[PDB]
Write a protein that holds these residues in place. Structure first.
Motif, PDB file in Angstrom:
ATOM      1  N   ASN A 233      21.418  30.476 -12.353  1.00  0.00           N
ATOM      2  CA  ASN A 233      22.739  30.038 -12.822  1.00  0.00           C
ATOM      3  C   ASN A 233      22.832  28.506 -13.010  1.00  0.00           C
ATOM      4  O   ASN A 233      23.784  27.897 -12.532  1.00  0.00           O
ATOM      5  CB  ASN A 233      23.855  30.545 -11.895  1.00  0.00           C
ATOM      6  CG  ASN A 233      25.234  30.314 -12.448  1.00  0.00           C
ATOM      7  OD1 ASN A 233      25.492  30.455 -13.676  1.00  0.00           O
ATOM      8  ND2 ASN A 233      26.175  30.023 -11.552  1.00  0.00           N
ATOM      9  N   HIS A 234      21.795  27.948 -13.657  1.00  0.00           N
ATOM     10  CA  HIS A 234      21.714  26.525 -13.944  1.00  0.00           C
ATOM     11  C   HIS A 234      21.788  26.431 -15.481  1.00  0.00           C
ATOM     12  O   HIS A 234      22.802  26.897 -16.069  1.00  0.00           O
ATOM     13  CB  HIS A 234      20.508  25.896 -13.248  1.00  0.00           C
ATOM     14  CG  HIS A 234      20.323  24.387 -13.375  1.00  0.00           C
ATOM     15  ND1 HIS A 234      21.288  23.445 -13.071  1.00  0.00           N
ATOM     16  CD2 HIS A 234      19.278  23.690 -13.847  1.00  0.00           C
ATOM     17  CE1 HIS A 234      20.791  22.213 -13.250  1.00  0.00           C
ATOM     18  NE2 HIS A 234      19.560  22.338 -13.692  1.00  0.00           N
ATOM     19  N   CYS A 235      20.752  25.886 -16.120  1.00  0.00           N
ATOM     20  CA  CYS A 235      20.609  25.883 -17.607  1.00  0.00           C
ATOM     21  C   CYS A 235      19.808  27.100 -18.122  1.00  0.00           C
ATOM     22  O   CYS A 235      19.220  27.866 -17.312  1.00  0.00           O
ATOM     23  CB  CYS A 235      19.920  24.555 -18.071  1.00  0.00           C
ATOM     24  SG  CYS A 235      18.201  24.406 -17.414  1.00  0.00           S
TER      25      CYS A 235
ATOM     26  N   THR B  56      10.447  25.319 -12.540  1.00  0.00           N
ATOM     27  CA  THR B  56      11.694  26.070 -12.402  1.00  0.00           C
ATOM     28  C   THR B  56      12.559  26.045 -13.673  1.00  0.00           C
ATOM     29  O   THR B  56      13.242  27.074 -13.944  1.00  0.00           O
ATOM     30  CB  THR B  56      12.521  25.577 -11.215  1.00  0.00           C
ATOM     31  OG1 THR B  56      12.914  24.191 -11.396  1.00  0.00           O
ATOM     32  CG2 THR B  56      11.769  25.810  -9.901  1.00  0.00           C
ATOM     33  N   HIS B  57      12.567  24.912 -14.396  1.00  0.00           N
ATOM     34  CA  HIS B  57      13.423  24.797 -15.639  1.00  0.00           C
ATOM     35  C   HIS B  57      13.022  23.565 -16.420  1.00  0.00           C
ATOM     36  O   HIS B  57      12.386  22.662 -15.912  1.00  0.00           O
ATOM     37  CB  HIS B  57      14.942  24.760 -15.268  1.00  0.00           C
ATOM     38  CG  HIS B  57      15.393  23.561 -14.473  1.00  0.00           C
ATOM     39  ND1 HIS B  57      15.028  23.327 -13.162  1.00  0.00           N
ATOM     40  CD2 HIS B  57      16.198  22.524 -14.825  1.00  0.00           C
ATOM     41  CE1 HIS B  57      15.617  22.200 -12.766  1.00  0.00           C
ATOM     42  NE2 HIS B  57      16.357  21.755 -13.738  1.00  0.00           N
ATOM     43  N   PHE B  58      13.421  23.575 -17.684  1.00  0.00           N
ATOM     44  CA  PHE B  58      13.103  22.544 -18.619  1.00  0.00           C
ATOM     45  C   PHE B  58      14.076  21.343 -18.583  1.00  0.00           C
ATOM     46  O   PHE B  58      14.823  21.109 -19.605  1.00  0.00           O
ATOM     47  CB  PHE B  58      12.999  23.139 -20.052  1.00  0.00           C
ATOM     48  CG  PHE B  58      12.255  22.244 -21.052  1.00  0.00           C
ATOM     49  CD1 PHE B  58      10.886  22.097 -21.020  1.00  0.00           C
ATOM     50  CD2 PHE B  58      12.967  21.603 -22.075  1.00  0.00           C
ATOM     51  CE1 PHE B  58      10.238  21.262 -21.924  1.00  0.00           C
ATOM     52  CE2 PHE B  58      12.308  20.775 -22.984  1.00  0.00           C
ATOM     53  CZ  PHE B  58      10.947  20.636 -22.927  1.00  0.00           C
ATOM     54  N   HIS B  59      14.139  20.595 -17.464  1.00  0.00           N
ATOM     55  CA  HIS B  59      14.790  19.330 -17.385  1.00  0.00           C
ATOM     56  C   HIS B  59      13.737  18.243 -17.080  1.00  0.00           C
ATOM     57  O   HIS B  59      12.777  18.479 -16.315  1.00  0.00           O
ATOM     58  CB  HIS B  59      15.945  19.276 -16.313  1.00  0.00           C
ATOM     59  CG  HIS B  59      17.238  19.912 -16.756  1.00  0.00           C
ATOM     60  ND1 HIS B  59      18.252  20.233 -15.866  1.00  0.00           N
ATOM     61  CD2 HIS B  59      17.716  20.187 -17.988  1.00  0.00           C
ATOM     62  CE1 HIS B  59      19.293  20.685 -16.549  1.00  0.00           C
ATOM     63  NE2 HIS B  59      18.965  20.720 -17.827  1.00  0.00           N
ATOM     64  N   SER B  60      13.928  17.052 -17.686  1.00  0.00           N
ATOM     65  CA  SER B  60      12.833  16.063 -17.691  1.00  0.00           C
ATOM     66  C   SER B  60      12.410  15.598 -16.302  1.00  0.00           C
ATOM     67  O   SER B  60      11.224  15.411 -16.131  1.00  0.00           O
ATOM     68  CB  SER B  60      13.121  14.866 -18.615  1.00  0.00           C
ATOM     69  OG  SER B  60      14.277  14.233 -18.202  1.00  0.00           O
ATOM     70  N   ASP B  61      13.299  15.428 -15.321  1.00  0.00           N
ATOM     71  CA  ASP B  61      12.823  15.014 -13.983  1.00  0.00           C
ATOM     72  C   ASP B  61      11.923  16.088 -13.322  1.00  0.00           C
ATOM     73  O   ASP B  61      11.169  15.784 -12.387  1.00  0.00           O
ATOM     74  CB  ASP B  61      13.988  14.737 -13.060  1.00  0.00           C
ATOM     75  CG  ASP B  61      14.719  13.385 -13.314  1.00  0.00           C
ATOM     76  OD1 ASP B  61      14.303  12.566 -14.175  1.00  0.00           O
ATOM     77  OD2 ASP B  61      15.738  13.154 -12.596  1.00  0.00           O
ATOM     78  N   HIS B  62      12.060  17.350 -13.739  1.00  0.00           N
ATOM     79  CA  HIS B  62      11.200  18.451 -13.291  1.00  0.00           C
ATOM     80  C   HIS B  62       9.892  18.651 -14.059  1.00  0.00           C
ATOM     81  O   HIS B  62       8.860  18.966 -13.445  1.00  0.00           O
ATOM     82  CB  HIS B  62      12.105  19.760 -13.232  1.00  0.00           C
ATOM     83  CG  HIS B  62      13.286  19.579 -12.337  1.00  0.00           C
ATOM     84  ND1 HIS B  62      13.307  20.043 -11.043  1.00  0.00           N
ATOM     85  CD2 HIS B  62      14.406  18.832 -12.477  1.00  0.00           C
ATOM     86  CE1 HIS B  62      14.400  19.627 -10.427  1.00  0.00           C
ATOM     87  NE2 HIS B  62      15.108  18.914 -11.296  1.00  0.00           N
ATOM     88  N   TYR B  63       9.895  18.516 -15.397  1.00  0.00           N
ATOM     89  CA  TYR B  63       8.635  18.702 -16.177  1.00  0.00           C
ATOM     90  C   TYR B  63       7.841  17.423 -16.410  1.00  0.00           C
ATOM     91  O   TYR B  63       6.749  17.511 -17.026  1.00  0.00           O
ATOM     92  CB  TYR B  63       8.865  19.414 -17.522  1.00  0.00           C
ATOM     93  CG  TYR B  63       9.741  18.690 -18.594  1.00  0.00           C
ATOM     94  CD1 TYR B  63       9.244  17.576 -19.280  1.00  0.00           C
ATOM     95  CD2 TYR B  63      11.000  19.197 -19.031  1.00  0.00           C
ATOM     96  CE1 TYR B  63       9.964  16.966 -20.328  1.00  0.00           C
ATOM     97  CE2 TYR B  63      11.756  18.561 -20.046  1.00  0.00           C
ATOM     98  CZ  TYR B  63      11.220  17.431 -20.674  1.00  0.00           C
ATOM     99  OH  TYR B  63      11.872  16.806 -21.741  1.00  0.00           O
TER     100      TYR B  63
ATOM    101  N   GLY C 235      14.937  25.959  -7.001  1.00  0.00           N
ATOM    102  CA  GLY C 235      14.965  25.006  -8.092  1.00  0.00           C
ATOM    103  C   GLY C 235      16.267  24.236  -8.096  1.00  0.00           C
ATOM    104  O   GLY C 235      16.803  23.930  -7.048  1.00  0.00           O
ATOM    105  N   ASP C 236      16.834  23.983  -9.307  1.00  0.00           N
ATOM    106  CA  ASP C 236      18.255  23.555  -9.453  1.00  0.00           C
ATOM    107  C   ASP C 236      19.070  24.863  -9.649  1.00  0.00           C
ATOM    108  O   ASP C 236      18.711  25.763 -10.445  1.00  0.00           O
ATOM    109  CB  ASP C 236      18.521  22.635 -10.642  1.00  0.00           C
ATOM    110  CG  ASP C 236      18.048  21.157 -10.439  1.00  0.00           C
ATOM    111  OD1 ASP C 236      17.772  20.767  -9.297  1.00  0.00           O
ATOM    112  OD2 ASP C 236      18.101  20.391 -11.446  1.00  0.00           O
ATOM    113  N   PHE C 237      20.213  24.951  -8.960  1.00  0.00           N
ATOM    114  CA  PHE C 237      21.053  26.203  -9.039  1.00  0.00           C
ATOM    115  C   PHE C 237      22.522  25.893  -8.847  1.00  0.00           C
ATOM    116  O   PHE C 237      22.944  24.874  -8.269  1.00  0.00           O
ATOM    117  CB  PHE C 237      20.578  27.382  -8.108  1.00  0.00           C
ATOM    118  CG  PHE C 237      21.068  27.356  -6.644  1.00  0.00           C
ATOM    119  CD1 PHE C 237      21.358  28.521  -5.974  1.00  0.00           C
ATOM    120  CD2 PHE C 237      21.129  26.149  -5.881  1.00  0.00           C
ATOM    121  CE1 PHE C 237      21.730  28.511  -4.614  1.00  0.00           C
ATOM    122  CE2 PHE C 237      21.496  26.144  -4.540  1.00  0.00           C
ATOM    123  CZ  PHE C 237      21.768  27.319  -3.897  1.00  0.00           C
TER     124      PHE C 237
HETATM  125 NI    NI Z   1      18.268  20.460 -13.626  1.00  0.00          NI
END
Ligand code: NI
Length: 341
Positions: free
Chosen positions: A93-95, A32-39, A115-117
């Protein structure tokens, strides 16, 4: 093992599930996005298909060195077919590069994964308005009524006005902003714009920002610290010892630091308005914690869900404790009874 709230039923898909090795039965891994807990877990050795936005794909290639043949970027707001299943990516509407994902299952079930939003009324006029969603995989980060915060616009107004006043009173003051991930670029870019400076930063952070498709970015950022009076540092350095140290490094060009820590929420939110925020000061250094959130407040989350009217909600955040899970399920039932679905 991979938790159930990362798996999409009736497919071979997973979402943000890169730290469990080979997930048995997974034919496509969405990010969903490039944040470390997700990738967490991705690297140049990954050899399964990764589906993501263009911006997240630029970051995978340049920062993590994922080979291009395994990166599948998709355009936003566009019906696409992946392994025989229709999907759409929506802006979260996150990063930068963050998406929500709509899955249209062969059996007729529709699933939204947020994802995160940070929920917004503008989402009520995307492709989401066009059909019913049965199951919602929901970013519940701030799912409790104590979590209020101001709009992003109100926060940036405060920051701009604070910085401009300080540097106009003292042309030898330095502005410092903390960061530890992508996101919240408006904070430092808006300050640098009002002061007619570029933002100065490390080579690693400049590389990261050059992946984000921000218009006219070459005009707004630089690796020449000497030519800049807005500096970006690691969030860890945004404290009195770290800032005193940084000031020594600038060779007497400056005699005062005004620093910003864009936090998520902090318990001064339950009492204090934005107009009334004050810094922590020691000597010639002042630190402002500003409530710039890229997650939904409780009320924003509640409005989105009561608009969408899902049949089932699956939380993706705060799922680790029984007390948290029970509390969230109570709010979901309140919202449903109030709105009548
Ligand atoms: Ni995030």
């Amino acid at each position: 093992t991979c938790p159930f709230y990362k798996k999409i039923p009736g497919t071979g898909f997973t979402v943000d599930a890169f730290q469990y090795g080979v997930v048995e039965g997974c034919t496509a891994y969405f990010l969903t996005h490039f944040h470390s807990d997700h990738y967490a877990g991705l690297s140049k050795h990954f050899t399964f298909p990764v589906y993501c936005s263009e911006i997240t794909g630029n970051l995978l290639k340049n920062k993590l060195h994922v080979q291009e043949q395994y990166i599948h970027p998709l355009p936003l707001d566009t019906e696409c077919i992946v392994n025989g299943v229709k999907v759409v990516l929506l802006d979260a509407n996150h990063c930068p590069g963050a998406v929500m994902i709509l899955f249209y299952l062969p059996n007729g079930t529709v699933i939204l994964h947020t994802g995160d939003f940070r929920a917004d009324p503008s989402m009520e006029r995307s492709l989401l308005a066009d059909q019913k969603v049965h199951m919602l995989y929901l970013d519940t980060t701030y799912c409790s009524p104590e979590y209020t915060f101001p709009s992003q616009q109100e926060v940036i107004r405060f920051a701009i006005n604070t910085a401009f006043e300080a540097v106009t009173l003292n042309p030898h003051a330095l502005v410092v902003c903390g960061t530890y991930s992508i996101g919240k670029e408006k904070v430092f870019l808006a300050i640098a714009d009002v002061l007619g400076s570029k933002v100065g930063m490390s080579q690693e952070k400049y590389k990261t920002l050059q992946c984000l498709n921000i218009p006219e970015i070459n005009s707004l950022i630089t690796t020449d610290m000497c030519s800049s009076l807005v500096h970006l540092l690691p969030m860890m350095q945004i404290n009195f010892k770290g800032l005193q140290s940084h000031l020594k490094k600038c060779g007497g060009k400056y005699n005062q630091i005004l620093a910003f820590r864009p936090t998520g929420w902090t318990h001064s939110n339950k009492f204090t308005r934005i107009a009334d925020v004050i810094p922590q000061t020691k000597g010639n250094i002042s630190i402002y914690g500003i409530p710039y959130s890229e997650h939904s407040s409780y009320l924003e989350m509640k409005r989105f869900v009561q608009w969408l009217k899902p049949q089932k909600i699956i939380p993706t955040v705060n799922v680790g404790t029984w007390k948290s899970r029970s509390t969230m399920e109570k709010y979901f039932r309140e919202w449903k009874l109030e709105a009548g679905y």
